[PDB]
Amino acid sequence: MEGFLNRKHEWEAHNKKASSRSWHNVYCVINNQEMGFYKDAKSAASGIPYHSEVPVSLKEAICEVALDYKKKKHVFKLRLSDGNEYLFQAKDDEEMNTWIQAISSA
Amino acid sequence: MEGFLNRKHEWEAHNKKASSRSWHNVYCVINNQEMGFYKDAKSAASGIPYHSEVPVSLKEAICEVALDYKKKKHVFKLRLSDGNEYLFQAKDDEEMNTWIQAISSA
Ligand SMILES: O=P(O)(O)O[C@@H]1[C@H](O)[C@H](O)[C@@H](OP(=O)(O)O)[C@H](OP(=O)(O)O)[C@H]1O
Ligand SMILES: O=P(O)(O)O[C@@H]1[C@H](O)[C@H](O)[C@@H](OP(=O)(O)O)[C@H](OP(=O)(O)O)[C@H]1O
Numbered sequence: 001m002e003g004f005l006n007r008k009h010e011w012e013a014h015n016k017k018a019s020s021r022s023w024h025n026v027y028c029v030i031n032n033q034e035m036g037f038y039k040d041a042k043s044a045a046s047g048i049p050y051h052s053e054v055p056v057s058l059k060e061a062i063c064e065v066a067l068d069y070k071k072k073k074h075v076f077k078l079r080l081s082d083g084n085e086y087l088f089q090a091k092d093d094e095e096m097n098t099w100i101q102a103i104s105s106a
Numbered sequence: 107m108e109g110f111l112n113r114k115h116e117w118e119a120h121n122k123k124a125s126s127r128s129w130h131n132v133y134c135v136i137n138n139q140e141m142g143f144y145k146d147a148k149s150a151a152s153g154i155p156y157h158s159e160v161p162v163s164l165k166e167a168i169c170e171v172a173l174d175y176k177k178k179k180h181v182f183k184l185r186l187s188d189g190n191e192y193l194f195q196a197k198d199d200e201e202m203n204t205w206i207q208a209i210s211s212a
Contacts, residue, residue, distance in 0.1 A: 001151055002108065031137055032153030045107055045212040047138030106151040 001102040002029040002044065006089035007037075013083030023089070026050055033058050033106045056080055063103040065096070076100050107208040108135040108150065112195035113143075119189030129195070132156055139164050139212045162186055169209040171202070182206050 009018040027038040037050035066077040074096045079085045090096040115124040133144040143156035172183040180202045196202040
């Protein structure tokens, strides 16, 4: 499963607020129980990472609709096992749910 | 880049005709200069291989429209560097070309 998604890094480990918190349009790929980030589809096929980011494991990840986040629509929350938390924005709700199911079933 | 494609194993290394030559509907994923095969999208996210197949490298691969193959339409040919050759069938020509560009640019 892959596609573009607006992403925001919210939390880091140990209840620390992430220092880098602006939204960025990234091309996401769910494969082999992990999620990789690329600038676009072409970088994804070539294996060139978003910002030297390493793919993250979706093992025991918590993924759900971000009701609490109100600054925008179709936003879902992803908390990785290591404590990092991201907010992802999809084009509409159907896609949002498509992503939530994909991740929750990895 | 990923999606379902009908696949046929044509050639093996050393100008040997592949022994296993029936068409099979497989879910293909182009990521990090390689191509993985899965039974479906869900197996792809989970990392469960098509038939214990290992992803193949697209490094120096030859990919083109299979003019010579006439038994069906929208079929492209992929020759890997190690000698293996596969024929892939897409739903239409646009998608076929989409796949040919994706692979040729990996
Ligand atoms: O450009 P900067 O320095 O990174 O600033 C951030 C940016 O404007 C984010 O869009 C904003 O998130 P929200 O849009 O979601 O408000 C975040 O606020 P935040 O502190 O609420 O996280 C800002 O700190
Ligand atoms: O079921 P089997 O034993 O695997 O038989 C093959 C199967 O019917 C393939 O569809 C056919 O390819 P084509 O459809 O493309 O004709 C192939 O012929 P082939 O020898 O031409 O490769 C057969 O050998």
